Design a protein around this nucleic acid. Structure first.
Ligand SMILES: [Mg+2]
Ligand SMILES: [Zn+2]
Ligand SMILES: [Zn+2]
Ligand SMILES: [Zn+2]
Lengths: 48, 78, 181, 48, 66, 59, 115, 29, 466, 44, 258, 59, 432
RNA sequence: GAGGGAACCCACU
């Protein structure tokens, strides 16, 4: 129903307005790097 | 007659730097002398350090009134 | 100020949370200005008194000159002004900290700048900050209940707590012997 | 609290609702702060 | 599945030793003596032959598609 | 209105996963339940149920 | 997927300089030698050979990132001496060392093989 | 004769090997 | 009974004869609550205070309380119990040889290690799990050391030279199924090699690698944007449109096998197995048999890894800090026992409750082979040749390559497919989807005060509309 | 084209829309030939 | 000129290993020599595989990897062989590569052990090492299984791939009695003595030498078979000298350019 | 595959180490996970909490 | 076509993300505002997100398979918002507990405990190699703490070069004696356990988690308060690089020899366990012969349980105290504990001496059978072995009953994590 | 130069 469309964490408001899928985002496994400064992240060339 | 803080807040600093950087990226005149650097953020921060950014911050009070502060009128303490 | 402190802190816990670390900046002034603690100082005690007075004048949390504004400003900086007068006492500054005149002027300027750097910025979403600051330690959490169930019993105002209890304190001799207790 | 030789000043409950109904809204504000502080600082954890 | 050509740690050739090791074990050698007869001194080369599972023999029991 | 997950696709990533999936028991108590007693390792599981092999998370 | 080719640890691509010298402005008579597509081998021998020169006041090397192939050798010398001259003399001494070691190894192999 | 404690480990793994030679591991299914 | 069972295939004496002899009997949980169990026969042969003189039953072996996955753990009674639980979880994710007839089978997901080894340190219960015949892992020279800082926070340094020699190399097999279907009289999907001027709505890809039956051939290299099954469906000049089966994106590989058959209802049915070789990589998950999971942080070559005086470099370097809070002492004992096992030429016994195996006995056995009795060795720095001041614990430990490679998880999106209903980005890397900027992220960006970034994420990086 | 029968190891010519059955033994599971295209492996 | 004057003492020279001692040099020189042993001594190994038929139970990349790990004799031919990156040919030529062919069909009821003896080279100076011990098992075939392939072997060193590493084990040691305290034993009596130790049985460790430096280095270079171990050491010294000479040339060009 | 030797299983392209214990449904291998339940025909007496019943017997 | 490759002023070029780009970096669950921080992009040649180690603490991240998210700001306003608001150096100190969230972690921590000890002396080449990794170094090699017989620098000199500006900080090492400050050697520490940094120079003391960690008043906290975010960022990076390169020389391990105690220590532990089991049997005999007096506010069974748990906790504490007292200065468990990097004294106690009592729901192991914990015990057995006291260590190995009871204990922690996540998340959502 | 949803299960941090 429309109420089931709107309600819940998967509904319209919580699942599509309070939070939503975004462009220009990447996700992968993290590995250590003691040679980077604390404000610096190593990024794979394919993601970039 | 202005009761708000004389210091530029961190949010004011962030938004003024971003807005001035976008204006410089849209070919606004540069208010300072630039030593051959390209990035609009760097030009915006050296304009802010020289306190020459031509932007007025309108701070809204909860009563609905507002105060207009020049960027050259605020203290950039951070 | 001591009487006001003992009203505020009746348990005698002197550990407080305050903006400017006065002892560390006195140590910083000693190291910067090469203060010899074994030599007499050139700092007049009246310079200490008047400098702390003007510094406390120019550490403003509540603006305004009306009596309501002055009372709110005095209340908002009461602990810090008490700690400032306690730390920058003329006796302590003369025989314990031994600061010079230029060291004391730099100390006043540093205290003023560090206090003005500590004031909350307008635009701070402090409610979300508070909700994340009380929920992040919750991830790491007489039969009195504590932890996450007690936090749930607190933020949900429960008419039926799991372990309701009193802490009854006794008056006079009733508190001193076990038989009348 | 009404009982004889019981301190009518320092005696308190851990029940938020009865502290509100007996002593008022500022007292239950202080009691709420004390109980939240107890829950937080049981572990030695500190929150500002 | 099949014996590796090299020891993983050092790169000593162990791919020519599996059948010799099996023949030594068939000749009533102990595993340590069979490893010592093949010149596998380092324990990194000895785990190559000691821990090898020769799955290719059981794979060869299936009729080939090709 | 019927129980789900009685029949599962057999895990074939390792022989150990195949054996473990072929010898798998399931309590049909909902994983949204926050009571600890069915999830606890009971004393009577000695020699019958492995005390180490359980999933992590809701199950 | 993001795997670099294995020859990139030792092959200079087109336009990549092998060694670049930069004057270190912090202290007098100091230079930074950025050597591309090398590793701890040459960096270690050159640093230890520069440490033997009494006119060298500082000698060190670093790999700034192990996933890159780059050596930074910082050399500081006395004012009457040059870090480029120190670096060249260190390479010359290492070359003479290896030439002498090569011929003595050949002599020792011949002696061991004859008996 | 009783199984001596020095032979017990070998004997118990013999009877376990016999159990898994007969039943296997998926006997319940 | 033991003598009769030693010749099980000669006497025809079996376990069932042992049950019929009145020697063993099956006790369930309700009856076990009335029996009196001796843990060992040492509880029977006990002196004047045996703690019980009325034992009714005896455990055959206590280590039989473990399951299939917990029986591969060496020294499980020297580990913390949650670590045994974590290893029982991860032994099902370890890549080895999952079945012998894997060449016949076309499973959707299949994983075959090149060189699976039986452990040097086994349990006796592993003789019946067939782990000696289908093992999942490699005995690895593991040094527990802090080297260059790249093994911190549950990470490992791998030997790149070892990896080049086939150390933990695996094969990923993926099967793709497709079938012609007669969904109506006019509709007719067919395996054909499509033509650009004839088929409607192609995906701008190449079709030359298809044979003229519409199916790609075995042995052909394929990439993420490649057609492997060419299926066209008749449209009721473009008489048919393209519904070809595509390879999953960024999953490069080689077509291993193509099988053509008939389904239940008699249409042509093709299954294509594509093979891709997975060399160990930074970010690939590796676990010992003690709950010591961790991704590869860096790979050093043999000349960069630390070495012993015999020239042995570790295959894997793990951080010391993985041990103390975990208390996986069975990992250390397995490493020590594996050093002893590889020097002696034997398979070490790590049955849980075994008094014949002790840390002191393993230490004396190791000292009998010219090594330090506690498994430490003097290691030399690979970069400089100088001795490391501390002496490094190093020896063979069984490691497992887990199914979680980084190349099956790396995902980026700039712009692409969106959902039909809410016009927001899709789900998962398989659909080129976006990541969810959830409610908690929204709260965090509220607390940051970054309102324009919040507007960018929640309005104009997701679904602008006017 | 040429498909190997799964059971009887023999090669069979199959045209399009022809049902996939081995003309020798009637086995319904058949496999494609290895390609003739030239594929290079680094020996790494 | 502050060069060392190192001396060589060969203590063992077999066909498999060389044990030798280098005196009067620095620790960095010794370690770099060891690193060039492992990483920067060029040999010839198979790097290009074209499989024509593979009916075996092992897939094509598996066979190619095993072929790459087979050592090939490289004595006196890897010096005159060119790198494929430095060669004027288009794809391959005898000046930069060696062609190998393998053609094995199993038609018997016995399992056919396709070994390195079945690798037939077009150059007689570059053959598998076990074809001059048993032969390195490439694959096992049953009846009806076949393997035809054509390979090309090219020059390379172990910095690129470990198949070009010529050494099995480079044992390296210095200061065997721990006089320099470069390692610190919590219990020195628990530690076995080195092979090169010069201590009595009652002593566990040398007295501390505050004026000492690492000056004597012990090597056991074990060869995988591609080169003789003395050829490995000589080629390593030559390669390190050539690296230093090329770096000196580029350094002189950089100095003159500024 | 019942009663077949390992050679007969290999001639049928089956793994002799494969345990069985599963079904093939539409070509997919399906295992039936065992399901726990309360035992039947047994009297179990519990104490229901926060209810009108002090004790309850169940069969 | 080249006609479509022409650029005019006012055009936009959607260029690839390159070095120096500002991104937001995130790990779920995003609990506080420092689980999403701004990072500068550096392109590295593998398929993972490389992360600095000190940054793993505000993310609650490790590298056992964690996946993290990276959001690219698309405009200059959002880029400047992230740059001036949400960068990692600006997020060093939290408003939650007015203390740093990121500190020195595990190997930098273990080796800065090992590096700032009094007997650490570095030669000229080692000092030059360490100064190669000091990015804030001014180029001047300091005068060594020892000039003759040989020029040797201490680790405190090199860390004084690392410490930025003129930080003045007084801390204590974790092994600082309680009576030392009242003794005659207060300002000259015999064990080097009073940390004094003066004018940015580490004058004395061994650094640890109490000095370089995420506590209030720590050295990185003073660096943030006095020098700002950029200098403190350089401080973190310099500590990590210099200490991680000295650890190549020094090295750190853990072995099976760190789990061994002395034979005298093993005898003491066995004697303590025997005495405590005898005490438990004596309390059992007192309760069985009705000679056990209940304490006020409790019934007889709960007073018996309190007495037994007091005896067994005293046993575990005394055996653990003997275990730590056996440990040498070379012990690596002790090194990682006194550095604050990983582990506790309880972990050392369980590895070396006694695992201890297994507890389910705060009590001993329940009688899941009829009055028996396991069918290997007699009925109404209230002794330590029966009810879940593990008298063995992890080195010694557990008995089968102890193994099963330890599994019962660890299942409780797994259940607690799994069922507390949902209620805690609901509490966070309602609070927000 | 990009055409399904839903349900369930397993797994990951
Ligand atoms: Mg993790
Ligand atoms: Zn080896
Ligand atoms: Zn046929
Ligand atoms: Zn050529």
């Amino acid at each position: 129903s429309l109420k089931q469309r709107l309600k819940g964490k998967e509904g319209r408001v919580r699942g599509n307005l309070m939070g939503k899928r975004v462009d220009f985002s990447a996700r992968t496994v993290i590995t250590p790097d003691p040679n980077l400064s604390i404000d610096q992240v190593g990024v794979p060339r394919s993601i970039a | 007659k202005r009761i708000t803080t004389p210091y530029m807040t961190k949010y004011e600093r962030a938004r003024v730097l971003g807005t001035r950087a976008l204006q410089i990226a849209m070919c606004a005149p540069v208010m300072v002398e630039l030593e051959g650097e390209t990035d609009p953020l760097l030009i915006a921060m050296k304009e802010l350090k020289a306190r020459k950014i031509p932007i007025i911050i309108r701070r809204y009070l909860p009563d609905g009134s507002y105060e207009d502060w020049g960027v050259d009128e605020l203290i950039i303490s951070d | 100020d001591r009487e006001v402190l003992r009203v505020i802190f009746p348990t005698g816990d002197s550990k407080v949370v305050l903006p400017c670390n006065l002892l560390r900046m006195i140590w910083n002034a000693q190291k910067i200005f090469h203060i010899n603690p074994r030599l007499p100082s050139d700092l007049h005690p009246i310079k200490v008194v008047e400098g702390v007075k003007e510094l406390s004048k120019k550490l403003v949390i509540v603006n305004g000159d009306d009596p309501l504004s002055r009372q709110a400003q005095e209340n908002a900086t009461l602990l810090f002004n008490i700690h400032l007068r306690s730390t920058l006492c003329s006796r302590r500054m003369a025989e314990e900290f031994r600061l010079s005149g230029e060291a004391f002027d730099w100390l006043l300027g540093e205290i003023e700048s560090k206090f003005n750097q500590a004031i909350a910025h307008p635009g701070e979403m402090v409610g979300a900050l508070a909700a994340q600051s009380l929920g992040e330690p919750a991830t790491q959490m007489k039969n009195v209940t504590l932890g996450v169930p007690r936090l749930k019993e607190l933020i949900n105002i429960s008419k039926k707590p799991k372990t309701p209890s009193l802490t009854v304190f006794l008056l006079g001799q009733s508190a001193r012997d076990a038989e009348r207790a | 609290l009404s009982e004889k030789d019981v301190d009518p000043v320092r005696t308190t409950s851990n029940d938020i609702v009865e502290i509100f109904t007996v002593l008022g809204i500022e007292a239950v504000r202080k009691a709420l702060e004390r109980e939240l502080y107890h829950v937080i600082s049981f572990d030695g954890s500190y929150v500002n | 599945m099949i014996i590796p050509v090299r020891c993983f740690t050092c790169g000593k050739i162990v791919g020519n030793k599996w059948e010799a090791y099996l023949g030594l074990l068939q000749a009533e050698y102990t595993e340590g003596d069979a490893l010592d007869a093949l010149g596998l001194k380092r324990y990194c080369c000895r785990r190559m032959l000691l821990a090898h599972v020769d799955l290719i023999e059981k794979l060869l029991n299936y009729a080939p598609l090709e | 209105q019927a129980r789900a997950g009685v029949s599962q696709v057999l895990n074939r990533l390792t022989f150990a996963s195949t054996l473990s999936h072929l010898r798998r028991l399931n309590s049909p108590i909902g994983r949204d339940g926050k009571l600890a007693k069915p999830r606890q390792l009971h004393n009577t599981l000695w020699g019958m149920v492995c005390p180490a092999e359980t999933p992590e998370g809701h199950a | 997927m993001n795997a670099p080719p294995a020859f990139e640890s030792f092959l200079l691509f087109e336009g990549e300089k092998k060694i670049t010298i930069n004057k270190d402005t912090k202290v007098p008579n100091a230079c930074l030698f950025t050597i591309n597509k090398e590793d701890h081998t040459l960096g270690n021998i050159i640093k230890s050979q520069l440490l033997k020169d009494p006119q060298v006041l500082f000698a060190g090397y670093k790999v700034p990132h192990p996933l890159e192939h780059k050596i930074i050798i910082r050399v500081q010398t006395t004012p009457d001496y040059s870090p480029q001259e120190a670096f060249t003399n260190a390479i010359t001494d290492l070359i003479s060392e290896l030439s002498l070691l090569e011929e003595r190894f050949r002599v020792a192999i011949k002696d061991k093989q004859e008996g | 004769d009783e199984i001596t404690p020095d032979l017990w480990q070998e004997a118990c793994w013999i009877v376990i090997s016999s159990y898994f030679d007969e039943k296997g591991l998926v006997r319940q299914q | 009974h033991i003598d009769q069972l030693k010749e099980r295939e000669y006497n025809n004496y079996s376990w069932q004869d042992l049950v019929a002899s009145g020697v063993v009997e099956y006790i369930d949980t309700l009856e076990e609550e009335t029996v009196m169990l001796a843990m060992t026969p040492d509880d029977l042969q006990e002196k004047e205070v045996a703690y019980c003189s009325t034992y009714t039953h005896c455990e055959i072996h206590p280590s039989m309380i473990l399951g299939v996955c917990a029986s591969i753990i060496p020294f499980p009674d020297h580990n913390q119990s949650p670590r045994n639980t974590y290893q029982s979880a991860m032994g099902k994710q370890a890549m080895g040889v999952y079945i012998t007839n894997f060449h016949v089978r076309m499973d959707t997901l299949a994983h075959v290690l090149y060189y699976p080894q039986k452990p040097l340190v086994t349990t006796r219960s592993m003789e019946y799990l067939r782990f000696r015949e289908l093992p999942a892992g490699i005995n690895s020279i593991v040094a527990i050391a802090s080297y260059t800082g790249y093994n911190q926070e549950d990470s490992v340094i791998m030997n790149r030279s070892a990896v080049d020699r086939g150390f933990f190399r695996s094969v990923f097999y993926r099967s793709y199924k497709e079938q012609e279907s007669k969904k109506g009289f006019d509709q007719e999907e067919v395996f054909e090699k499509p033509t650009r001027e004839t088929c409607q709505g192609m995906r701008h890809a190449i079709y030359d690698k298809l044979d003229d039956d519409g199916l790609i051939a075995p042995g052909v290299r394929v990439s993420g944007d490649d057609v492997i099954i060419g299926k066209t469906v008749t449209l009721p000049r473009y008489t048919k449109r393209d519904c070809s089966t595509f390879l999953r994106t960024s999953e490069t590989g080689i077509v291993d096998q193509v099988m053509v058959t008939l389904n239940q209802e008699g249409y042509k049915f093709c299954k294509i197995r594509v093979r891709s070789v997975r060399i160990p990589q930074i970010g690939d998950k590796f676990a010992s048999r003690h709950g010591q999971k961790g991704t590869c942080g860096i790979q050093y070559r043999q000349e960069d890894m630390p070495f012993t005086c015999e020239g042995i470099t570790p295959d894997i370097i793990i951080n010391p800090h993985a041990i103390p809070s975990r208390m996986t002492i069975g990992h250390l004992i397995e490493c020590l026992q594996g050093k002893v096992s590889a020097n002696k030429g034997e398979i070490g016994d790590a049955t849980p409750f075994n008094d014949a195996v002790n840390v002191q006995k393993i230490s004396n056995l190791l000292s009998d082979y010219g090594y330090h009795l506690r498994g430490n060795e003097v290691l030399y720095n690979g970069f400089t040749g100088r001795k490391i001041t501390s002496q490094i614990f190093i020896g063979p430990t069984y490691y497992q390559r887990l199914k979680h490679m980084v190349d099956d998880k790396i995902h980026s999106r700039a712009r692409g497919p969106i959902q039909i209903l809410n016009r927001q980005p899709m789900e998962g890397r398989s659909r080129d989807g976006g990541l969810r900027f959830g409610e908690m992220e929204r709260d965090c960006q509220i607390a940051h005060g970054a309102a324009q970034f919040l507007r960018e994420r929640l309005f104009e990086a997701s679904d602008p509309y006017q | 084209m040429i498909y190997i029968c799964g059971e009887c190891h023999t090669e069979n010519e199959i045209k399009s829309r022809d049902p996939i059955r081995c003309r020798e033994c009637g086995y319904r599971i058949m496999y494609k030939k290895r390609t003739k295209r030239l594929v290079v492996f680094d020996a790494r | 000129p502050y060069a060392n004057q190192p001396t060589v003492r060969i203590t063992e020279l077999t066909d498999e290993n060389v044990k030798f001692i280098i005196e009067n040099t620095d620790l960095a020189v010794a370690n770099s020599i060891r690193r060039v042993f492992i990483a920067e001594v060029p040999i010839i190994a198979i790097d290009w595989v074209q499989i024509d038929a593979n009916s075996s139970v092992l897939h094509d990349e598996f066979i190619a990897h095993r072929l790459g790990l087979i050592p090939l004799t490289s004595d006196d031919i890897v010096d005159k062989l060119q790198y494929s990156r430095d060669c004027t040919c288009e794809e391959f030529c005898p000046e930069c590569s060696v062609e190998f062919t393998l053609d094995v069909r199993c038609n018997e009821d016995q399992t056919r052990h396709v070994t390195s003896r079945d690798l037939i080279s077009n150059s007689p100076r570059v053959i598998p090492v076990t074809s001059r011990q048993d032969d390195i098992l490439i694959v096992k075939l049953r009846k009806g299984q076949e393997l035809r392939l054509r390979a090309y072997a090219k020059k390379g060193f172990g910095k690129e791939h470990a198949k070009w590493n010529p050494t099995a084990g480079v044992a390296f040691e210095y200061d065997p009695d721990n006089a320099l305290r470069h390692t610190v034993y919590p219990k020195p009596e628990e530690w076995p003595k080195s092979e090169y130790s010069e201590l009595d049985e009652d002593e566990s460790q040398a007295p501390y030498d505050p004026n000492g430096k690492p000056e004597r280095f012990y090597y056991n270079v074990e060869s995988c078979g591609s080169l003789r171990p003395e050829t490995i050491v000589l080629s390593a010294l030559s390669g390190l000298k050539k690296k230093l000479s090329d770096l000196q040339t580029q350094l002189s060009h950089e100095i003159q350019s500024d | 595959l019942n009663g077949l030797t390992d050679r007969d299983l290999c001639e049928l392209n089956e793994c002799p180490l494969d345990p069985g214990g599963y079904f093939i449904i539409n070509g997919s291998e399906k295992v039936l996970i065992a399901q726990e339940k309360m035992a039947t025909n047994t009297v179990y007496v519990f104490a229901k909490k926060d209810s009108k019943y002090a004790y309850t017997g169940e069969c | 076509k080249p006609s479509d490759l022409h650029l005019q002023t006012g055009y936009k070029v959607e260029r690839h993300m390159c070095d120096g780009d500002i991104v937001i970096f995130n790990r779920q669950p995003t609990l506080h505002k420092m689980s999403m921080m701004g990072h500068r992009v550096r392109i590295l040649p593998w398929s993972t997100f490389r992360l600095n180690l000190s940054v793993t603490t505000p993310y609650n991240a490790d590298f056992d398979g964690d996946e993290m998210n990276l959001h690219l700001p698309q405009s200059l306003e959002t880029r400047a918002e992230i740059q001036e608001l949400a960068m990692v150096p600006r997020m060093i100190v939290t408003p939650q507990s007015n203390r740093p969230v990121m500190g020195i972690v595990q190997d930098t921590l273990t080796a800065v405990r090992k590096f700032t000890k009094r007997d650490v002396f570095l030669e000229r080449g080692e000092v030059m190699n360490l100064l190669m990794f000091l990015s804030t170094w001014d180029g001047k090699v300091p005068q060594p703490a020892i000039l003759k017989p040989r020029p040797l620098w201490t680790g405190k000199q090199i860390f004084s070069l690392i410490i930025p500006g003129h930080i003045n900080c007084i801390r204590t090492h974790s092994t600082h004696p309680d009576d030392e400050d009242s003794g005659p050697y207060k300002h000259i520490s015999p064990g080097d356990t009073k940390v004094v940094v003066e004018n940015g120079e580490l004058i004395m003391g061994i650094l640890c988690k109490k000095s370089l960690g995420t506590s209030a008043g720590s050295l990185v906290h003073i660096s943030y308060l006095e020098m700002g975010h950029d200098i403190t960022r350089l401080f973190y990076s310099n500590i990590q690089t210099v200490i991680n390169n000295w650890l190549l020389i020094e090295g750190h391990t853990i072995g099976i020899g760190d789990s061994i105690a002395d034979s005298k220590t093993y005898q003491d532990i066995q004697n303590t366990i025997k005495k405590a089991k005898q005490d438990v049997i004596e309390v059992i005999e007192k309760a069985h012969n009705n000679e056990l007096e209940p304490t006020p506010g409790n019934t007889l069974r709960q007073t018996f349980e309190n007495q037994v748990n007091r005896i067994l906790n005293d046993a575990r504490d005394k055996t653990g105290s003997s275990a730590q007292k056996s440990l040498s200065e070379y012990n690596n468990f002790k090194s990682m504990v006194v550095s604050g990097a990983k582990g506790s004294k309880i972990n050392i106690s369980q590895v070396i001496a006694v695992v201890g009592q297994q507890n389910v729901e705060g009590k001993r192991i329940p009688f899941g059978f009829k009055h028996r914990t396991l069918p290997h015990f007699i009925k109404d057995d209230y002794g330590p072995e029966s009810r879940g006291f593990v008298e063995n260590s992890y080195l010694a190995g557990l008995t089968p009953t102890e193994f099963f009871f330890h599994a019962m204990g660890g299942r409780e922690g797994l259940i607690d994590t799994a069922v507390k996540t949902a209620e805690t998340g609901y509490i966070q959502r309602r609070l927000i």
